[PDB]
Amino acid sequence: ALADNCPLEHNPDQLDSDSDRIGDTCDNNQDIDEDGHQNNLDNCPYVPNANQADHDKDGKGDACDHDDDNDGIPDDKDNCRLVPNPDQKDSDGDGRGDACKDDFDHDSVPDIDDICPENVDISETDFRRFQMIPLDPKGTSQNDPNWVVELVQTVNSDPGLAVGYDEFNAVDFSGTFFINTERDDDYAGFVFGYQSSSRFYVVMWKQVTQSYWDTNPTRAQGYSGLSVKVVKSTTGPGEHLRNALWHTGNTPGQVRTLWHDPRHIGWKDFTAYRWRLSHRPKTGFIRVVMYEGKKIMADSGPIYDKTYAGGRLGLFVFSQEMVFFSDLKYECRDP
Ligand SMILES: [Ca+2]
Ligand SMILES: [Ca+2]
Ligand SMILES: [Ca+2]
Ligand SMILES: [Ca+2]
Ligand SMILES: [Ca+2]
Ligand SMILES: [Ca+2]
Ligand SMILES: [Ca+2]
Ligand SMILES: [Ca+2]
Ligand SMILES: [Ca+2]
Ligand SMILES: [Ca+2]
Ligand SMILES: [Ca+2]
Ligand SMILES: [Ca+2]
Ligand SMILES: [Ca+2]
Ligand SMILES: [Ca+2]
Ligand SMILES: [Ca+2]
Ligand SMILES: [Ca+2]
Structure with missing residues (x-):
């Protein structure tokens, strides 16, 4: 039943x-x-x-x-x-x-x-199968995400996800994102260990440091650079999660930032970036490396966190228009 x-x-x-x-x-x-x-x-x-x-x-x-x-x-x-x-x-x-x-x-x-x-x-x-999930279906600071097909997000939108169907324990996830415009300097990334809209890991990259224009519910300052965060929201999609996702750091009852590039290096317009992620739930191992061609742009190094034991993979977007995702790949790494 x-x-x-x-x-x-x-x-x-x-x-x-x-x-x-x-x-x-x-x-x-x-x-x-x-x-x-x-x-x-x-x-x-x-x-x-x-x-x-x-x-x-x-x-x-x-x-x-x-x-x-x-x-x-x-x-x-x-x-x-x-x-x-x-x-x-x-x-x-x-x-x-x-x-x-x-x-x-x-x-x-x-x-x-x-x-x-x-x-x-x-x-x-x-x-070839995506579940689109708006991360703030409550607030209307900005229009919600709009996806089209190269999977593209065309709006300077509120946060949102595009998550896959398969579930994983240990996994290696790689993909490519391209910002087809010089306009704006916000977020593009991906998620893994996705379980619910209140439970998932997220990797995001911002081009230029900027404080979120709406100080409510909480002050949020997003620094340029690659960041690794874990989401465990007590409220779920909404304004609270919205600001928390933007903030480079911790937001009570919402987000915890596990790592952030100390150099604060932002992504470049019109540039193809390849990400490589490894997650090992048994030990809590997490590591993401960003590549520009065959050049290493960012490396999180070994990160350990056991908040979530696995889940789905997906794409992340937050206030950045014309984000082109492509060439997504994944492989299980069990046992
Ligand atoms: Ca909204
Ligand atoms: Ca730009
Ligand atoms: Ca911006
Ligand atoms: Ca449910
Ligand atoms: Ca549930
Ligand atoms: Ca179980
Ligand atoms: Ca269980
Ligand atoms: Ca924006
Ligand atoms: Ca098989
Ligand atoms: Ca087989
Ligand atoms: Ca047998
Ligand atoms: Ca047997
Ligand atoms: Ca067994
Ligand atoms: Ca044999
Ligand atoms: Ca069995
Ligand atoms: Ca059995």
């Missing part, structure tokens, strides 16, 4: 106020392991497992299942952990069973070309 009508992916015809893909009628926000799946809709309630992998579909996610394929051979001794193979046949004796030698998760996409080799639910990128 719940794991049938609750998920927006099973029935999109319902409300989902916090944009976490769980219908309002079922949403209770109880998530003890903070992996983005509430307790009663988590196949491993106490073990962090954001992608909810369950290869034998027995109700116990791989993360809390001792025999992920139910073939009687425990994971630790199974030479084909995700493919049933009782005889453990291994004709060349390399420790990998014949049953899964070319396609470990049996999603019909060989290991080498499979971006998520140990996840039957993901085999290729599908960033």
Whole structure:
């Protein structure tokens, strides 16, 4: 019943106020392991497992299942952990069973070309599907985001997101953004570990330092440079989150800035930038590097934070028109 009508992916015809893909009628926000799946809709309630992998579909996610394929051979001794193979046949004796030698998760996409080799639910990128989420559908300081298609955001808008469909535990995420205009000097970036419109990590880059023109609800000063922040809003999309996202630092009950480039180097107009992000939920590892061609423009260095155990990936925009995103790529890094 719940794991049938609750998920927006099973029935999109319902409300989902916090944009976490769980219908309002079922949403209770109880998530003890903070992996983005509430307790009663988590196949491993106490073990962090954001992608909810369950290869034998027995109700116990791989993360809390001792025999992920139910073939009687425990994971630790199974030479084909995700493919049933009782005889453990291994004709060349390399420790990998014949049953899964070319396609470990049996999603019909060989290991080498499979971006998520140990996840039957993901085999290729599908960033052809975006969920647009306005970060301030309350205030009207500026018009909300407008997206078109090269995914472009055309308005000097209020903050907003464009988030993908796939969910990840450990992941490497890369992409390209281009500001096709010399007008303005604000924000462009991306998100990862996205769970709800009140829960996600965000990486943003501003061109020139500037204080947000509306001192309400809180004073916000955004410095030029790359920043890494974690959002845990007590209010959700609105004016409070708005100013907090802009502020280079911490805003009570809204945002925490984990790192900011000490050099405050802003992005350049009409320049293609490539970002490379690595997130390892198990240890809380986070690192983002920005590139201008083959040149390194910014490097966050190792950052550690375990607020969120995983989630979706997406694009971020805040008061910057003509932001062109393209060539998005991602790969799972599990275990
Ligand atoms: Ca919801
Ligand atoms: Ca929720
Ligand atoms: Ca959970
Ligand atoms: Ca879990
Ligand atoms: Ca299972
Ligand atoms: Ca397991
Ligand atoms: Ca099992
Ligand atoms: Ca097994
Ligand atoms: Ca097996
Ligand atoms: Ca073998
Ligand atoms: Ca595969
Ligand atoms: Ca796969
Ligand atoms: Ca608005
Ligand atoms: Ca500019
Ligand atoms: Ca500006
Ligand atoms: Ca602006």
